[model samples]
Target chain A: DEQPEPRTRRRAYLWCKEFLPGAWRGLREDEFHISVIRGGLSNMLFQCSLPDTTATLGDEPRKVLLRLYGEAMVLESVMFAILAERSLGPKLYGIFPQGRLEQFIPSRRLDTEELSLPDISAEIAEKMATFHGMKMPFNKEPKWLFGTMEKYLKEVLRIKFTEESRIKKLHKLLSYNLPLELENLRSLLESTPSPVVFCHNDCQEGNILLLEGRENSEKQKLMLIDFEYSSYNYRGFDIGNHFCEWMYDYSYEKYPFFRANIRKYPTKKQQLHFISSYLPAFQNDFENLSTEEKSIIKEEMLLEVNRFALASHFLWGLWSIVQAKISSIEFGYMDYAQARFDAYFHQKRKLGV
Target chain B: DEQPEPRTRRRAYLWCKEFLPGAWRGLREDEFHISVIRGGLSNMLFQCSLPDTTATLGDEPRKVLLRLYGEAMVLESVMFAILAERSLGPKLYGIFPQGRLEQFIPSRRLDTEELSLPDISAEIAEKMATFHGMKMPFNKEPKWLFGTMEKYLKEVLRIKFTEESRIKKLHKLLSYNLPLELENLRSLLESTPSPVVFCHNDCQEGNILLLEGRENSEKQKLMLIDFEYSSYNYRGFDIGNHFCEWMYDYSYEKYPFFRANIRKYPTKKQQLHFISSYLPAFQNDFENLSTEEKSIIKEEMLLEVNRFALASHFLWGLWSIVQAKISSIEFGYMDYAQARFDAYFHQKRKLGV
Candidate 1:
């Protein structure tokens, strides 16, 4: 991990001194403690606190989350504002030119295995549904996913290949009909018809926050964070990409290290369970429907989601290629890129796209 | 210039929300404006303000200065703290890991021309004397200048130069006995003998702030800022460097573009005039001094300052070389390094070093 810059530390200290009132107004660098939170690839996260200050005490210093954005993730400012206003993410406490301070809601990031459970899966889907339902200030038909992929591919192709073996591998992967596939997907979406909703494109397990200390409640209230990639896209893309996320564990260490568990993909029954909560039916009252009617509704939603799964793989495949060249993040971008392409082909073949 | 990151913007907003109590407690991103103050290379500066809330209004919002540090300047936190406590620098409002908020004093960063004027020079010398007198927390026998240059050179020599022309140029420049010169200078300093004071090692014109609103005042109070390169060193280097600084301007555009006006280096009379204000000791009491006594003092100080001028040039020459490799700032670091070396050699030749 890249250690925080000295300037960054001093700036953060100065920021706290200016922004934090009461006892924290003139806080010294050593008086407070800062620890980096271990999630996020494109941005850095840190939890800032005054030592010995706990929530139980009224005089305890205010604890906040500091997020330092990677270079040029500018769109996130607007997206974060929208999400914060709607209570779709953490409460923003302060903002700066390089990052922001957010309310630190102590929570555990969900893992891939936990995301597959029936209850958790349902909850995640409901959150996705709620996010997609928002009347965000975005273009009605945001060509966000494919447009970004196109940009990524253009830059990827321009990368000067130095390693012979890696170049050969990339050459083979690039042989796929990516642009054609994207064009076809666009046409398919135009004809098949799906609502353009505010979709959290990168809804991987790491982004889903499961609040701790609320274990007494039967249903866990999940919150989504990291909105750098959120935009107006196909509703199916959001749900399908989330389902795809259940397959890979990016936290694993080693080459081609991400664990891809195919069997863990939600079963037909699991899909029915998740989609039922996500798209709660008041329009057609499926609760009073016959068994045949219920199965039909489930199958139709399942098929649509499955088709959009191709878009998810292709989108991430392009993203991985770009990250391979430019990202300072320590993940295996080349291997991830290959994995996404492999997933893309496999999903496309299964869907007969 | 790279735009400030979205995360930084968000963090600044969060800081305002948390620190700016009352009307600013929950200030949204759009409710305020942040503009780049445009004077630093090692750190970025921004002036954050709320609209139409000048101090005249009872509940008006307070404006703050945001300073974001460069990659790794951890030691500056302690330095800033000490200076702030002594009222030797700006009032620090807050501290963070990466940067800080400081009290923004509206002032002009004096140009080389302004710095040379008789009154301004005397005021600067007085400020320097006051700074040097402070019993700082630093170790008394700090081997800061040559020690840091040696460290930087060690790292510079280890760089596996990728660019062909840069490598060739660096190779030619490395032929000089910089290590030898440094060794000789150390021996010289040991023999010559001088008092060690807390020196602002990079106290060029840019770091000196002459407050504009203080125009009506009899004595124009000058404030020294940017203490990142400050340390306990020979008082001569501080004085010599400031004298040397009167010769060049870093703000000039183009390669090898900095204006070096040699005539601007303080003459014997100017040095005597400046030092009189700095050291107010009267050999025969403050009432008066004979022509012979004053001339003796002027000649003695001039001789000492002239010898230390070589040390100043050599120190900055080494610094410029290191910055040439690592700094992302727009200034021509390579050209600047060559200029410093040229200056060092020129000073050495004149002083018969």
Candidate 2:
């Protein structure tokens, strides 16, 4: 599989230690336990803490986290990350070749209550806008990790195992359709010469931290906690990722009902908010970087955003099929599975899945 | 990353020893070995005594060479190896999933002299004719390997680092050009469906194994090897691969002063030899296979073959610059670098790289 596991572990540990300063040296391996907290597929994450010293219950906890990268898995580059840290990004303490080691800001994951919270959606939109407004690492290759699903299907075929029919169907469809789309995306994203920007590929409620003293405080800040899949890629992709997360999972329940519940279709207001937040940081340097670069970036970003929305429709649609298959066989997670299927197919039918 | 490495190893090892009885194997802790005295890429060879003590050495020392696969890289597939073992192929003995185990042959690799022996070209043509004469894989999806190759390329481009320039270029060329040529080739190849026979994906001198002892032995007991890339591809590609290798390597010293020295160029005798040897194996099957099926396959194969050839020309020709960049600096064989550049630009000026 992944070679250099020892190097991966050592680098992550060292980066984490660097983030903690002298206090890290005193913490024994036992005192500072690092347990791998899983979920992010492209990169690995570890939960680090002096376990014996979790003092305050309700207050956010102080912990360390490590992220590892390979190839184009992340959307941030060194320069973009540096720029992001100066304004919209998290406090940067340590960086490694694979990924970054950062403070593990403790906060309750965004829940249904927060989704319905008076200004939660607005706040999220605002935070995303702020990050997008900043210059990002957009020049590096635009890598999409989700393509592994097609590979998995191929393996199933190679071995001649009884794979889910959905996988086989998707395989045929992807072979028939997706490659051209991917090429289109690549051309659109990298048509010109421009430096990339840093981005948090996975921007969801759980990864976003709300730090405030009281139940409701005006001085609250939205802390981006996950930097695992963050790296240099298309800025629109990052926007799409966060936009996708907002309308996905339990967090969707908290959003104001009146807000347009669009996925692949973006309202002009949402686009404006997103671009407005993302433009300011890089707008200053964009003109200096290249002639007519802003228009190129804008056109490509719009294309990327469209791709992102379509990709989710396909993913959720594929996921629905997986769930349906599982439900057909095992009948577990039936409701949730059916929900995913409905969500996916609904869009697929609309988009000709 | 691949999971259950141990399981894959066991399955592969079992497949080799069981399927290919001539092959010998031994066990190691982190590694294992299979004796293949053939192609040398990443195989670990050894000069060991036979496990059966009774086996004694002859004029040639009885040495078994063990090569571990997957350690360096995985063998492509057993499909080509199957073609080799039946003597209908290059006389391959071992192919494993672990990517480690290799074939065990008791012959030395042939040099240009051996490959170029008199009448050897006739043998190569006849054997390929015989091979194409066989029945197609019944009810398999896209039975031809070129179709599969085209399919795999599509799937692979969607992979994580797919947006790299080199890959994008290939993807773009394939998508833009494949369908356009498909219709043209369908008509061209279908015109002689019954006359067509089975073809080795790549048929060059290196793959033609000439028996030394008997008179005209090259015609009687020819052994074709290295079928890893073989498929139910085009008869034209098989003949083309032979001539192409000669054209590239300039192997005219062996073929004698003919009308130019290509193995299967537009020469009357060359065409007669290929058809004569091939007719025996194909005459019946071509008539037996459904007219519709034959037409479809012939056309598809022709189109795929020519498109691939053109792609090779472009990728290896002048367009190599763009191709190289698109592949993220991964040129499968460095020898093809300049050729790709040459082919690309020539075609662009003519065929559009």
Candidate 3:
């Protein structure tokens, strides 16, 4: 599926030549296999393979990820380095100006439908929590959620909103007293006590990878990928954003590309199961707690996550609006923006905030 | 000159294991073959080699440069990616969280004394100019020199001056009216019209490499390496800083490790010769131009480079001061800071700025 253009193919060949000088000899285009890794909007991902004898004596295939960067993706290479250092992501093999070469993990990219399954969701939550627990090298005042939202909103606001009737109507509705609403949201969140930790930021199903475990052959190990939006933020935001992703499927190959299934939002039991897995100590105590106490803790967590869920929608909503103006991705940015806004309002109204 | 601690060596071994898989098998510390490549203060540079048959069926040795990053090296992998994409530096093979694997050129590094040789200086100038001509992917507003300088200075200032008498005295001398001088320099340079280009900011003799050319072996080819400080800046700064580097011998092993030899500053004729090589069009036009016109152009360049020479000294001066407080590298940081400040004053006085 990964058919790169002639120009890109030439570049890839050249990169291989430079990166693997001794082995590059006698290697031809046919020998250099590039297979598409599905699901990316800001980058074109391909798995490039060389002959089994390239790096070793065995028949195991030598492969790397060839990612071609597109416009406007927030690439924090320092954060990526931190993640790579921790083995939190794939190893970076070669870095080029136009793109980079990363270690290709033989894994399955989860679909939205698969992501909601109880077993998978629990694994995702645990992986997310583990990463969040790591100390990030950089620190910032925890205003990124609002700061990035406002920055994107500024670009969206500047766009002449005369393009589509649906977009124009959505923009008008969202813009009404939006600045005050955002400011109040920022203030309330700033005052709230949430532990700031490194978040995957964008943990959609597409970015969650399941590698086959060697020792535990029956259980698939999880690895998080695509660190474009990774940064230090509130722990709740990551879990909440992931919860938001459960409702929408972006892989559909048509206009109005995403499908929202609100009923699929994790049930109370599912939420507790995931939270306990994320905090193993909680899992142990959860078994010991009285039913009433467990119910109280669950409701508290639900309230905290529900409040932060609005922030996730607000963040992505503004991002989509900005993307509508500048992104070359084929997905419907305006429609995506509308969908996010619709979700945001629904969450906000339901929370009575 | 570059013996890494056991801890660092262990980490390096682990990286090769993950990055090179099968080839890393049976590769012991005894077989690793690490040799020191001198003259890096912030990074421990070593040439790592394996047997010819390590990766392929060739007699040529498999080699890489293992660089252990130090504190605050400002290594943006994106910038390294840009340099690698252009073949402007060594090929990046494996990138780790700790450091990276780079193609090791079996080349000689130039010393301060060697950098002044007419033939070598000319080639260095041409390579610098060619790199500056390339369009970088990122556009930065040109405050990095002053901004980084201040940031380092702030860190240095926070240290109690009385802790080290030598540092105290040096600081007292350099700190006098220094802020005003820097402000004046910033304002004057800000008003000047200098073309901003992507710069290998630290273009000292130690960083310029000379590789022995084979087969068509008429001459040794030159390549630039170690782009940790590369960024968009005034072209004059890179050239001036390179020129500035010619005055000090940092490779010396004794106390007062650096020797200031202001007399080694390239003569007017030598500077002109290097500039002519950098701009081949100017070399061609030199024959046709009137003696007065040529003299005027040379003076203009001398004046431009002279102003930037002070900037080079000031930038390194502040960098050394910060290094004094934080760096674990053995060569005298306090004395190095003093030497840079002394050079800064000398350049400022010579330039009458």
How would the candidate models be sorted by DockQ, starting from the highest?
3, 1, 2
Candidate scoring better on DockQ of 2 and 3: 3
**For candidate 3, lDDT tens digit of each residue in B1-353?**
46666776676665554444235534665556566664365566777666555573322226677776651322365556546655777655555555666777877777788787777777787788777775443333466778877787667667655466655656574666667777887876776556667788988877877775532333346777777677768878988898888888887878767777778888778888877776553244565777788777767777777778788887787777766666667667677766767787787787676
Query: Poorest 10 consecutive residues of model 1 chain A by lDDT?
Result: A52-61
* Rank by lDDT (best first): 1, 3, 2
Q: What is the C-alpha lDDT of each candidate?
A: 0.70, 0.44, 0.69
TM-score of each: 0.48, 0.32, 0.51
Docking class of 1: incorrect
lDDT of each residue in A189-258, candidate 2, tens digit only: 3543333344565676677777644347643456555555554444555665555554545423332211
Runs in model 1 deviating more than 4 A are A1-8, A26-30, A38-42, A53-61, A70-74, A281-297, B1-353
Give the alpha carbon lDDT tens digit for every residue of A1-353 in model 3: 75777776777776654543234534676677766774365577787777665563332227778787751221366455446655777765555566777777888778888776767777787788778765443333355777788887677667765577746755564665668778877775665556666788998988887775532343346778877777668877888898899889998888878887667777767777777666553244455777788777667667777677778888888887777767777777777877777887777777777
Q: 1 or 3: which has the higher TM-score?
A: 3
Q: How many backbone clashes does candidate 3 have?
A: 1
Q: Give the higher-DockQ candidate: 1 or 3.
A: 3
Kindly list the per-residue Cα lDDT of model 1 for residues A93-182, writing each as its tens digit: 555566777778888888888887777888887788778865543333456777787887788777766777668767876787667767
Clashes of each: 51, 60, 1
* Candidate 2 residue runs with Cα over 4 Å from true position: A1-353, B1-67, B71-103, B108-118, B136-198, B212-218, B250-266, B284-353
Candidates' chain B TM-scores in the order shown: 0.86, 0.52, 0.82
Candidate closest to the true structure, highest TM-score: 3
Q: DockQ scores for all the models shown? A: 0.01, 0.01, 0.03
